[PDB]
Structure formats: C-alpha cells, structure tokens
Amino acid sequence: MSELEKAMVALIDVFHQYSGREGDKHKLKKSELKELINNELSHFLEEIKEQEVVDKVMETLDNDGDGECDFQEFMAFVAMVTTACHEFFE
Amino acid sequence: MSELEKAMVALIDVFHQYSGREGDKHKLKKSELKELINNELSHFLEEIKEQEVVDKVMETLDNDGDGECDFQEFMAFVAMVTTACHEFFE
Ligand SMILES: [Ca+2]
Ligand SMILES: [Ca+2]
Ligand SMILES: [Ca+2]
Ligand SMILES: [Ca+2]
Ligand SMILES: [Zn+2]
Ligand SMILES: [Zn+2]
Numbered sequence: 568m569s570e571l572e573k574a575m576v577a578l579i580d581v582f583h584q585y586s587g588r589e590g591d592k593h594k595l596k597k598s599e600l601k602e603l604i605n606n607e608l609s610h611f612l613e614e615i616k617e618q619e620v621v622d623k624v625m626e627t628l629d630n631d632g633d634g635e636c637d638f639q640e641f642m643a644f645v646a647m648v649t650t651a652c653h654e655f656f657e
Numbered sequence: 658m659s660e661l662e663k664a665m666v667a668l669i670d671v672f673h674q675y676s677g678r679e680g681d682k683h684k685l686k687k688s689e690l691k692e693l694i695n696n697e698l699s700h701f702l703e704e705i706k707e708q709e710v711v712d713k714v715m716e717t718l719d720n721d722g723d724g725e726c727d728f729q730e731f732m733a734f735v736a737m738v739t740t741a742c743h744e745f746f747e
Contacts, residue, residue, distance in 0.1 A: 571697040574667035575739045579746075581661045607661040638743060639736075646732040649665040653728055 581607055582641050594635035597621050600628075611648055671697055672731050684725035687711050690718075701742055 568576065585603040586595050595603065601621045604612050615621055628636050628644050636644065658666065675693040676685050685693065691711045694702055705711055718730045726734065 568700055569671075569697045570667050571671045571693075571735075572700055574664035574671075575701070575735065575742055577660045577664035577667075578739055579743050581659075581664075603661075607659040610658065610662055611665070638740065642736040642739060645661075645665065646729075646736060649668055649732060650729065652665060653669050 578642070578645055582638060586638075586641075591635060594633075594637050595641065596635050597625050600625060600636055608648065611652055668732070668735055669728075672728055676726075676728075676731075681725060684723075684727045685731060686725050687715050690715060690726050698738065701738060 581603065582595075585599045586593055588599055588602075590596055598621075601615050604624070605614055615624070625634065625636065628640050630640055630643070631637070671693065672685075675689045675697075676683055678689050678692075680686050691705050691714075694714070695704055705714070715724065715726065718726050718734045720730055720733070721727070
C-alpha cells in the first residue's frame with residue numbers, strides 16, 4: 568500500500584480498536600473516545616483527566632445527537648485534529 | 658508517535674508532496690490531484706486516464722469554487738475514500 572493508503576487503513580484500524588470494546592461495536596462511547604485520545608493522540612491533544620473534557624469533546628463531535636461517535640463523526644474528528652496540526656506547525 | 662498520529666502526519670505529507678509541485682504550493686490543481694490519485698491511491702481507486710474524470714473529481718471536492726483542492730477539501734476527499742475502504746471490507 569502507498570503511504571496514503573496505509574494512513575487510511577490505520578484510521579479504520581484505530582476506530583475499530585476502540586469502538587468495539589463496549590456497547591455498539593461501530594460507535595465510540597465517551598469512555599472509548601477518552602481512551603482513544605489519551606492513548607493515541609498523546610502528542611497532538613492534551614490528556615483527558617476530567618469528565619467535563621470528555622463530555623465537551625463528545626458534544627463537539629456528536630452531530631447526530633446519540634451521545635456516541637460513529638465512523639463519519641470520527642472522520643470529522645480526524646480532519647479537525649489533522650487540520651489543527653497542519654496549521655499549528657507551519 | 659501512535660499509528661493514528663503517524664497516519665495524520667502521513668495525510669499532511671502526501672498532500673504537501675503533490676500540492677507543492679505547480680502553481681499554488683499549498684493547493685492541488687487538477688494535474689496534481691490526478692497524479693496524487695494515480696500514484697497514491699492506485700490500490701483503492703481506478704486509475705484516472707480521461708480529462709473528464711479529473712474535471713469531475715475536482716468539481717466534486719472543490720467546495721469553495723477556486724478550481725483547486727485545498728487541505729480542508731483534501732481532508733473531505735480522504736474521508737470519502739476511507740469510508741469507501743471501510744465499507745468495502747465489511
Ligand atoms: Ca463502542
Ligand atoms: Ca453520534
Ligand atoms: Ca499546487
Ligand atoms: Ca477549492
Ligand atoms: Zn467497521
Ligand atoms: Zn501546508
């Protein structure tokens with residue numbers, strides 16, 4: 568696979584690794600999303616150690632209002648983080 | 658870096674690799690977009706060999722109407738292709 572193709576498979580992989588832990592296997596619940604950020608975005612995002620922060624991140628991400636982050640929402644999250652990095656480091 | 662972090666860096670890298678070739682160093686013109694898809698998405702998307710296909714792809718991802726693909730628009734493109742790969746495997 569190319570570098571881009573690899574990167575895409577890696578986004579699918581990490582989503583599944585966290586979404587399948589509990590409840591809906593295809594959605595991130597707040598605790599799944601917290602572990603994903605803390606473990607996998609430890610350099611791009613401040614560690615989450617407060618319920619209020621987990622809450623705010625889900626509120627921000629959850630466009631369909633079911634209190635979970637689905638794959639489309641996770642893509643949007645990936646784009647906002649990646650964009651932030653893009654901008655920040657130039 | 659985590660696999661997710663490395664993937665995000667990979668998106669910014671490839672984008673810069675192609676956007677930097679001609680004209681606007683920070684946006685993809687049609688020629689740069691065609692070569693990105695052809696070289697970097699050769700295992701996920703059919704090879705582009707017709708002007709009308711690159712025209713149509715650009716029209717599709719060019720949401721601000723400048724005839725180029727900026728990083729934000731490239732991220733929506735990445736999300737489209739990733740989603741398709743996701744579905745494909747399932
Ligand atoms: Ca879940
Ligand atoms: Ca949701
Ligand atoms: Ca360019
Ligand atoms: Ca545009
Ligand atoms: Zn899935
Ligand atoms: Zn840039």
